[PDB]
Amino acid sequence: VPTLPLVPXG
Amino acid sequence: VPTLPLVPXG
Amino acid sequence: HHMLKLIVETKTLVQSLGFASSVVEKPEYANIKLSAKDGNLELSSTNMDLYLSQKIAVQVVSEGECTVSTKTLNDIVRKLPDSELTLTDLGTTGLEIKGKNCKFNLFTLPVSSFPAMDSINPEASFKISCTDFAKIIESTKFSISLDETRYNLNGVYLHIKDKEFCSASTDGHRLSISWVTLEKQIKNFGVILPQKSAEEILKIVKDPKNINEDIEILLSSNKIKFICNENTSMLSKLIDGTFPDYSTFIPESSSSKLVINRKMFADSIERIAIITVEKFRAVKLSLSRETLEISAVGEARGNAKEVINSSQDKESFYEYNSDESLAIGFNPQYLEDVLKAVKSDVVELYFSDVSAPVLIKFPENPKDIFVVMPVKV
Amino acid sequence: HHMLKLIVETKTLVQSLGFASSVVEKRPEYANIKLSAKDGNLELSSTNMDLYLSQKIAVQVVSEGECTVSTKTLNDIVRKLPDSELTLTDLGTTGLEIKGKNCKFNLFTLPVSSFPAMDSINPEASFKISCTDFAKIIESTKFSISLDETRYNLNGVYLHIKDKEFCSASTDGHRLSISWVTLEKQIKNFGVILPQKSAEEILKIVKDPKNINEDIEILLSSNKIKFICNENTSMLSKLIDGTFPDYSTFIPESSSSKLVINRKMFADSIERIAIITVEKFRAVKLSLSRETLEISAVGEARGNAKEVINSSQDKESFYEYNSDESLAIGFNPQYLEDVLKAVKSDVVELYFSDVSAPVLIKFPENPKDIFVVMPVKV
């Protein structure tokens, strides 16, 4: 379950 | 909170 | 071989699965047995103390049986849009539910692991209208005890007195009795039908497909069976206890009588009751010939009062044929349960002293009796 | 003296008490509501640590004054009164009297000097938009707020003005929702994070039949936001103290294939197929080709399911996929369902890249609502 490109956090 | 004359229990 | 295959009207299957799933409430572990035979689909649901069999007409393509998860099958069928569905046990791939554009495969569990309905040698059986049976349960289900330490009050007492078939319930604070005349003389008997059994058979008799038909009731020493309108049978355990002799609970005489519009009364009780707190669920009826004041108090909450004036008008009817005044308390919930049990224009309440029960009668409904203890106010 | 006494239309008071009680919900017996009668109006004030709600309703003010009572007790009582209008009267030691034609309730009061007044706002930006526009913007973004409280800056909607666009964005790391409206007047850029509960309450207020066809004024500052919905209702809300991520970097700049599909048909099919899934693996697979789409799923120890959607230029069953290549890509069905139900649209567009890259979701007749949803491995 990959996350959106939040930086940081994903 | 009185009860009916159930015997036992009232 | 013998593998199940059938086409079924979707709407009819949804209805059946609705009844099947409410029966096993206490549910990811509950299974439903599907049996296709002789032009019918038979759906079986069961728990520790209930067994429900529903038969619906289908196009039986191949006879057979299987069991799948009740919830998964119910959830799926409710969401399919086609008017008809095909069900096919395909063995290792499971039970296939097939609509026009989609296929579901459900894992099955062996039929040898699903119990059949018990067989019963009925000592007594009779038929009453579903309307009559619905009334007797609806006038009595609400005053069952919920205290599980009172085993013998956790159901409705279904019993025969001469040719009258009656339901009674009590919890020590109120008593409800509802009965109907039977066509044939029949042996005396009394059994305590468990609450959940009563609620599920009530839902069945109220179904639009059955409400205008008959229900057969077959009794055995430890089990009761309902066959509602031929195609639905429910076999229920009985509660192992002895319902108290209620004959002394019904007041033989009264000092004063109240006739009052039922809707007006019920609405006013429930309104005034809002101010109360859990520790003191009580409304006070201050009754006189000219007025009734319903009042209540709630600690750290406030107080409330409603005034009902004497009136010969139907919408607001109030008559209290006494020169004495009487201030008497009741749990508002217990009055409300009775007032809502019967669709009647007016209701009669028979009183003695503030610590004696009220007897409640509905004039157009002579086979329904309710008794409610007061509370100190 | 100066004791409150007023006559109020019952239905209107019920409506107001509904908003007063829902605003002070928090993870109810302790909440008080301030009643203030003055200049032809009743002002009802409700507040907690995070929001202050002031509601004004026209009443027959017989005597000016104020009092406070339990919000819950007043709500429960007024909801059960049958008269079209009620009389409210502070009777001192007798409490607050609520009177219909045939019944009287007396409520304990608490001293008014113990009830906080509303704070003010020094707005960096203020503007007015229609309630329908504001409702759409929250409706399109409330559902993708994070519920993970260790991610404080994602537990709200980022309400912001960028180049005369008033926008709400929300994200939870798995999806992003963006909805905006263009403003008429020149206005400075500014952004604040409105907490979820504040968003839910103002949405409910904006959806009232008395408000939905009118306007809401919105004032933004670094430490609070204020809404004035249709003149007579004001809500002042604290903001989440954090920094919303640059969400523009989440939006795919290019896509390799595009799906156009009837929205209800798509949403209904996803929901239907998702039933077989289990909590550990909330996923549906989209197997996309030019000629067909199969939506499939598996649930461990439950079963499996597949639905076939064929290509069609008919509006009711529309399906078009402009690629010679096949694409099998999974999504959490809930996250797709939420986007599909947020916008009343005939068709929906999905723009894909890689199986591990987010999908961009657009509605062609609703160009100011944009959604991004991460896939899951299937």
Detailed description of the structure:
The complex is a heterotetramer, with two copies of chain A (10 residues) and two copies of chain C. With 10 residues, chain A is low in regular secondary structure. Chain C has 377 residues and is of the alpha+beta class. Chain C has a domain at 5-113: DNA Polymerase III, subunit A, domain 2 (DNA Polymerase III, Chain A, domain 2, Roll), CATH 3.10.150. The longest helix of chain C has 14 residues, at 10-23. The radius of gyration of chain C is 25 Å and the shape is elongated. The N and C termini of chain C lie far apart (73 Å). The chains are: A little secondary structure (10), C alpha+beta (377). Strand 9 (102-106) of chain C pairs antiparallel with strand 21 of chain D, so a sheet runs across the interface.
Quickly list its features.
heterotetramer, A: 10 residues, little secondary structure, C: 377 residues, alpha+beta, DNA Polymerase III, Chain A, domain 2, eight-stranded antiparallel β-sheet
Quick gist of this model?
The complex is a heterotetramer, with two copies of chain A (10 residues) and two copies of chain C. With 10 residues, chain A is largely without helices or strands. Chain A has no helices and no strands.
How much of the sequence lies in strands of chain A comes to: under 5%
Portion of residues in helices of chain A? Answer: under 10%
- Structural shape of chain A: elongated
Most residues in contact, chain pair and counts: C-D, 31 and 31 residues
How far do the termini of chain C sit from each other?
73 Å
PDB class: transferase
Keywords: ssgcid, dnaN, DNA polymerase III subunit beta, Structural Genomics, Seattle Structural Genomics Center for Infectious Disease, transferase
Assembly: tetrameric
Entry title: Structure of DNA polymerase III subunit beta from Rickettsia conorii in complex with a natural product
Helix-strand layout with pairing:
The complex is a heterotetramer, with 2 copies of chain A (10 residues) and 2 copies of chain C.
Chain A: no helix or strand
Chain C: E1 5-9, H1 10-23, E2 31-37, E3 40-46, E4 50-57, E5 59-62, E6 64-69, H2 70-77, E7 84-89, E8 95-98, E9 102-106, E10 124-129, H3 130-138, E11 155-161, E12 164-170, E13 174-181, E14 190-194, H4 195-205, E15 214-219, E16 223-228, E17 232-237, E18 256-261, H5 262-273, E19 283-287, E20 291-298, E21 302-309, E22 318-320, E23 326-330, H6 332-339, E24 346-351, E25 358-362, E26 365-372
Antiparallel strand pairs in C: 1-5, 1-7, 2-3, 2-6, 3-4, 4-17, 7-8, 8-9, 10-15, 11-12, 11-14, 12-13, 13-26, 15-16, 16-17, 18-22, 18-24, 19-20, 19-23, 20-21, 24-25, 25-26
Helix pairs in contact in C: 1-2, 3-4, 5-6
Organism (chain C): Rickettsia conorii (strain ATCC VR-613 / Malish 7)
Subcellular location (chain C): Cytoplasm
GO molecular function (chain C): 3'-5' exonuclease activity; DNA binding; DNA-directed DNA polymerase activity
